[PDB]
UniProtKB/Swiss-Prot annotation:
Domain named tr-type G: residues: 6-205
Protein name, as recorded: Translation initiation factor 2 subunit gamma
Source organism: Saccharolobus solfataricus (strain ATCC 35092 / DSM 1617 / JCM 11322 / P2)
Family the UniProt entry places it in: Belongs to the TRAFAC class translation factor GTPase superfamily. Classic translation factor GTPase family. EIF2G subfamily.
Cofactor: Mg(2+)
Residues the entry annotates as binding Mg(2+) 2: 18, 43
């Protein structure tokens, strides 16, 4: 039979609102992650979506139909058992223009991505561009472009759009990114997509000797219906491990941690705890490695792990030396244009005293620019950040026309 292992790779699903991201994740995994009525009432799904699947190959059948997402070869007309390849997970990022920050949060977890482009809409829509550029900046360059909703357009329309997309990727880092036509709704040509995922989004090399670091996704910020969060022994903290590994019974800390407030003075103090259990999907494990949304059981009271006063952005081993900073220095670069805006806009230079939004790991923090000199800024953060490394790229956003727009990026210098 097929093994039960944790997912070994995270694949983002990005693109403009209503282009078919959640439907595509369903076509691949069988799982619809969002709540239909909530989406109806709000006109959007604000949480990240998360789902998993095993991937196999029927070695007798021919490709792409030989690829399967369950232990059967019936889809390619064979009674043989498919060979297990790997388990993968998807991170369904919101496409709505008011939700870039959430997308950026999700993007911190991606090892690769699928950009979903609706065939029946003008390419490229504002969040098509914004998400594409964000992926570029962050370094999620193992990309597949999917032309979705091919069932509603003619061959000529699809061809025309294809030419637009080729023209778009031409002369960029994505010049050789494949473009795969599908219908997510009708599950048309999904096997070619799986084939593409195996070809273009290889599981990255993981150096398990690195210090363990996990980026935290608060439970209120994610729809992960398939992942067990058992509070029997205490609060469960979900997220994704970006380096090293964690093990049951290990001592860990949540950083920046708990908001304290002693005599007008405000600080965030680390929350130490211990791993009581580790879960992926509906299975328990002795250890957890990068890839997948892991559920780390602790011995903490759930009232703490769910608290607004807990700034839980990362988890590390208890021994880890991690600066927690209220004021940071960033060596930045600005985009030329506000790529996510409807109007054609140049991004203005960074000005002292302006408010910026900083995406660091899975966290989002507003800050005031105290100093701007050359290609470095100093910013006083509304809440501190935990800087677990010297090589950390933050994404910079600015409020424009009542929405937060990505305008650039930088290195957090410590
Ligand atoms: N005709 C057609 N409709 C689709 C397809 N994929 C998604 N849709 C529809 O388009 C709408 C947007 O899909 P959704 O996955 O919610 O887009 P998201 O906002 O990017 O997650 C939904 O009503 C889907 O039923 C497709 O391949 N063909
Ligand atoms: Mg959706
Ligand atoms: Mg139909
Ligand atoms: Na599956
Ligand atoms: Na198949
Ligand atoms: Na990544
Ligand atoms: Na068609």
């Amino acid at each position: 039979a097929w093994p039960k292992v944790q997912p070994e790779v995270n694949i983002g699903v990005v693109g403009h609102v209503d282009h078919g991201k959640t439907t595509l994740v369903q076509a691949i995994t069988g799982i619809w992650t969002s709540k239909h009525s909530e989406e109806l009432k709000r006109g959007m799904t604000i949480k990240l979506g998360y789902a998993e699947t095993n991937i196999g190959v029927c070695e007798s059948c021919k490709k792409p139909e030989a690829y399967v997402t369950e232990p059967s070869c019936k889809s390619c007309g064979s009674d043989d058992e498919p060979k297990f390849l790997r388990r993968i997970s998807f991170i369904d990022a919101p496409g709505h223009e008011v939700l870039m920050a959430t997308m950026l949060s999700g993007a911190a977890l991606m090892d690769g991505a699928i950009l979903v482009v609706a065939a029946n809409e003008p390419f490229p829509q504002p969040q098509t561009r914004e998400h594409f550029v964000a992926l570029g900046i962050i370094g999620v360059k193992n990309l597949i472009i999917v032309q979705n909703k091919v069932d509603v357009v003619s061959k000529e329309e699809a061809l025309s759009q294809y030419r637009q997309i080729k023209q778009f990727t031409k002369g960029t880092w994505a010049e050789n990114v494949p473009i795969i036509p599908v219908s997510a709704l009708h599950k048309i040509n999904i096997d070619s997509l799986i084939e593409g995922i195996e070809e273009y989004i290889k599981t990255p090399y993981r150096d398990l000797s690195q210090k363990p670091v996990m980026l935290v996704i608060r439970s209120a910020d994610v729809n992960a219906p398939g992942t067990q969060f058992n509070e029997l022994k205490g609060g469960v903290i979900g997220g994704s491990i970006i380096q090293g590994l964690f093990k049951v019974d290990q001592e860990i800390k949540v950083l920046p941690g708990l908001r304290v407030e002693k005599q007008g003075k405000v600080s965030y103090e680390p929350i130490f705890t211990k791993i009581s259990s580790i879960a992926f999907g509906d299975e328990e494990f002795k250890e957890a490695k990068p890839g997948g949304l892991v559920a780390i059981g602790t011995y903490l009271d759930p009232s703490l792990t769910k608290a607004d006063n807990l700034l839980g952005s990362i988890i590390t081993l208890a021994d880890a030396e991690v600066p927690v900073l209220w004021n940071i220095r960033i060596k930045y670069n600005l985009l030329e244009r506000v790529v996510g805006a409807k109007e054609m806009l140049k991004v203005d230079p960074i000005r002292a005293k302006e408010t910026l939004m900083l995406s660091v790991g899975s966290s989002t923090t507003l800050g005031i620019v105290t100093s701007v000199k050359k290609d470095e800024i100093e910013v006083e953060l509304r809440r501190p950040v935990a800087v677990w490394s010297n090589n950390i790229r933050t994404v910079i956003s600015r409020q424009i026309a009542g929405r937060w727009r990505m305008i650039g990026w930088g290195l957090v210098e410590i």
